[PDB]
């Protein structure tokens, strides 16, 4: 049967094996996340989803930790806020200043989560990291200095598209996401990496520089290019 957990003291009935992030979503709280995608596997590396359990001295990765009976999840606690601020601080410390020239622009998860969960000032007094851009076809434009090594594109590529030509090379702060060779990521499902990349590292090349998200009007229609009716 369902077990009883608590989110900020509010009782929730969840199935065994449900994660902390899913319990908070069920109660109505969307925990900030970068590497977590519901359609993909659980990676738990960006560490942005760390939350505090009421009696646990250590924060837990909400996207990977299954809930136990009688767990009180403190979503808006001081420890959770400090953890989110620290993770955002590291991300933006190594992130480059490209927002005006970056197509992700006003629809960026890094920007929005920085404005909602991170600090507003920088303590980084050193130089930043620069990463050589790759070329993976005429559809996806890669500016890899903006990558946050969230491994969404790798996981999507392998699991969904059945193509394992993406991965991380090297280790440490020098880890780079790409192909390691001049190979184009050509597949019939290669725009979804543009969609799911939380930052502007992977962007649409035909759409490059043309518009900004706040200007666009969204019309909900269907697809006719095939018989799927997407």
């Amino acid at each position: 049967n369902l077990i009883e957990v608590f989110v900020d003291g509010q009782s929730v009935m969840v199935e065994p094996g449900t994660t902390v992030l899913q319990a908070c979503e069920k109660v109505g709280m969307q925990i900030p996340r970068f590497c977590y995608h519901e359609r993909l596997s659980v990676a738990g590396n960006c560490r942005m989803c760390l939350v505090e359990i009421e009696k646990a001295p250590k924060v837990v990765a909400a996207c990977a930790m299954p809930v136990m009976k009688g767990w009180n999840i403190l979503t808006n606690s001081e420890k959770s806020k400090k953890a989110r601020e620290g993770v955002m601080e590291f991300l933006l410390a190594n992130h480059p200043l490209d927002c005006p020239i970056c197509d992700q622009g006003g629809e960026c998860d890094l920007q929005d989560q920085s404005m909602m969960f991170g600090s507003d000032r920088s303590r980084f007094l050193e130089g930043k990291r620069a990463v050589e851009d790759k070329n993976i076809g005429p559809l996806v434009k890669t500016i890899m200095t903006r990558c946050i090594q969230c491994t969404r594109c790798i996981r999507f590529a392998s699991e969904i598209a059945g193509v394992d030509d993406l991965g991380t090379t090297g280790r440490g702060n020098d880890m780079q996401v790409g192909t390691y060779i001049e190979k184009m990521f050509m597949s019939e499902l290669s725009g979804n990496i543009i969609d799911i990349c939380p930052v502007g590292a992977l962007t649409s090349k035909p759409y490059a520089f043309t518009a900004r998200p706040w200007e666009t009007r969204k019309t909900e229609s269907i697809d006719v290019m095939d018989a799927v009716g997407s």
Partner: protein, 125 residues
């Protein structure tokens, strides 16, 4: 005492809208789809009523995008589908209602990435 009106509410004669934009307009009541470029779901909370798209042409001078439809930018926010339907009915516009699409609950397990005998094992991290 207090009178009773056993008839549907209709304020079209009082709103002042032209008959063309009363009769030939079909609004769309729906919950907006999540912007696929972001994982945030806070913009998919409230129902929205929006009108149908009309013609836009190019200005002969300066090449701007002209219009002739007053209700082009008119978008209304409603807390409930019933509230939006009642508003549309009392204002007399036609309406198409689309049901809210909520993601189905999914079973996620970190340990499935290292299955001993299942295909769920991942080849990289």
């Amino acid at each position: 005492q207090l009178i009773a009106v056993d008839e549907k509410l209709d304020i079209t004669t009082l709103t002042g809208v032209p008959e063309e934009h009363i009769k030939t307009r079909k609004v769309r009541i729906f919950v907006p789809a999540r912007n696929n470029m972001q994982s945030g779901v806070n913009n998919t909370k409230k129902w929205k009523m929006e009108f149908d798209t009309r013609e836009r042409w190019e200005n002969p001078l300066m090449g701007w995008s002209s219009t002739a439809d007053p209700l082009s930018n008119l978008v209304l926010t409603f807390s409930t589908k019933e509230d939006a339907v009642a508003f549309a009915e009392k204002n007399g516009w036609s309406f198409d209602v689309e049901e809210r699409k909520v993601p189905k609950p999914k079973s996620k397990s970190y340990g499935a990435n290292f299955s001993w005998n299942k295909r769920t094992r991942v080849s990289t991290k």
